[PDB]
Amino acid sequence: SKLVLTGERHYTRNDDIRQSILALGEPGTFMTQDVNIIQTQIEQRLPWIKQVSVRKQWPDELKIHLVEYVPIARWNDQHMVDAEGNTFSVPPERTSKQVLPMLYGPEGSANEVLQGYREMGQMLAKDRFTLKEAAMTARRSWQLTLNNDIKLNLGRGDTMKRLARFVELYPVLQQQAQTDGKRISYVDLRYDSGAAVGWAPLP
Amino acid sequence: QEALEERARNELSMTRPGETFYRL
């Protein structure tokens, strides 16, 4: 029996597969096992695998082809979400030097959060602001973190009007922080037509 | 919890010591 492993692999390493197999049969090998259980075992021991196919090719060969999920953001913190809203996780020894945007929300809200992250990032992009973090509460209030580390508190209201107010007001907040030797730390927008600004000393 | 601070903030124009307020 030869075991042929194929597909584009960014997180899986070969011991992940062989362990899934031995942990089911024995220290001996694998051929006329059920291909559907070899497939199910691998789906369950490797939660970052989005698709795996297991197929017997004679002479004597078992061929496994892998498709991995691809993260576009960390989800809450220890997990990850892809561009279609799917949730998965990767042992953090293997992801500890990646730098991804950061989403947060209640346990089944990834798609909703990712949608809001997309829409709001679009608007901030029209003014060359870029979104590093986005958190949504069970009540569906929003807080954003720019790449320049300013936090924005949007609460629950028309988040897009409050977003536009930040951008309008930003040049004076920056002149003001410029003048007093401080840095902008956050901008609370949860008012009818104003903003409260918290400062911080310069790093 | 933070619902209270949203009304406190939105319904009455209240802030927190140290913050600067801007009205447009």
Residue numbers in the entry:
A (entry chain A): 58 to 260
B (entry chain B): 64 to 87
Task: Give the original sentences from the paper that presented this experimental model.
In Gram-negative Escherichia coli bacteria, FtsZ recruits cytosolic, transmembrane, periplasmic, and outer membrane proteins, assembling the divisome that facilitates bacterial cell division. One such divisome component, FtsQ, a bitopic membrane protein with a globular domain in the periplasm, has been shown to interact with many other divisome proteins. FtsB and FtsL are small bitopic inner membrane proteins (103 and 121 residues in E. coli, respectively). Previously, the structure of the periplasmic domain of FtsQ from E. coli has been solved by X-ray crystallography and shown to consist of two subdomains, named α and β.
In line with these findings, we present a crystal structure of the periplasmic domain of E. coli FtsQ in complex with the periplasmic domain of E. coli FtsB. FtsB binds to the C-terminal β domain of FtsQ, presumably furthest away from the membrane. Only a C-terminal portion of FtsB was resolved in the crystals, comprising residues 64 to 87. FtsB was not obviously degraded in the crystals where checked by SDS-PAGE, so we concluded that residues 22 to 63 and 88 to 103 were disordered. FtsB forms a helix, followed by a linker largely in β-strand conformation, leading to the final β-strand that extends the central β-sheet of the FtsQ β domain by binding to its last β-strand. Both salt bridges are also involved in binding to FtsQ via D245 and R247. The region in FtsQ that interacts with FtsB has Y248 at its center and is at the membrane-distal end of the protein, which is in agreement with the previous cross-link data. Although FtsB 88V is not included in the structure, the last resolved residue, L87, is immediately juxtaposed to FtsQ S250, and Y248 in FtsQ is the central residue of the hydrophobic patch on FtsQ that binds FtsB.
